[PDB]
Amino acid sequence: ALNEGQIVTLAVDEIIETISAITPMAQKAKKYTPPAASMQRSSNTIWMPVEQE
Amino acid sequence: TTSFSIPDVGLNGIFATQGDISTLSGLCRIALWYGVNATRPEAIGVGLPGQTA
């Protein structure tokens, strides 16, 4: 008895809140967003620099 | 297909539904595309108690 939009909204809200709630370790790891964001399915090998000494 | 993102964790995902008559039910798919990298493994520690040997 849930319309399509209601299905999508409830599902996305539930996913976001519960995953953000029950992930303690993943929230302590630094978040990296690749500079090159393109619509491609092949997994690129992202090279992030490390601190220079 | 609805594309969502979890800001607290930093995961990007997609939520999709479709109807199947081979199951008389609506297929639902949730994807999370992420890669965990252990940058500087020298900074990651493991504590091992009770190594009596």
Binding site: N3, E4, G5, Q6, V8, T9, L10, V12, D13 | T2
Partner: peptide, 30 residues
């Protein structure tokens, strides 16, 4: 009070299909 009105706004947003507005209104309700 206004909680029941923002709940109706949440339901309208959910039926429309806007996740962002639904989440903002849910945060407002709590």
């Amino acid at each position: 009070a206004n909680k029941d009105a923002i709940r109706k706004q949440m339901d309208a947003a959910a039926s429309k299909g806007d996740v962002e507005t639904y989440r903002k209104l849910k945060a407002k309700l709590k």
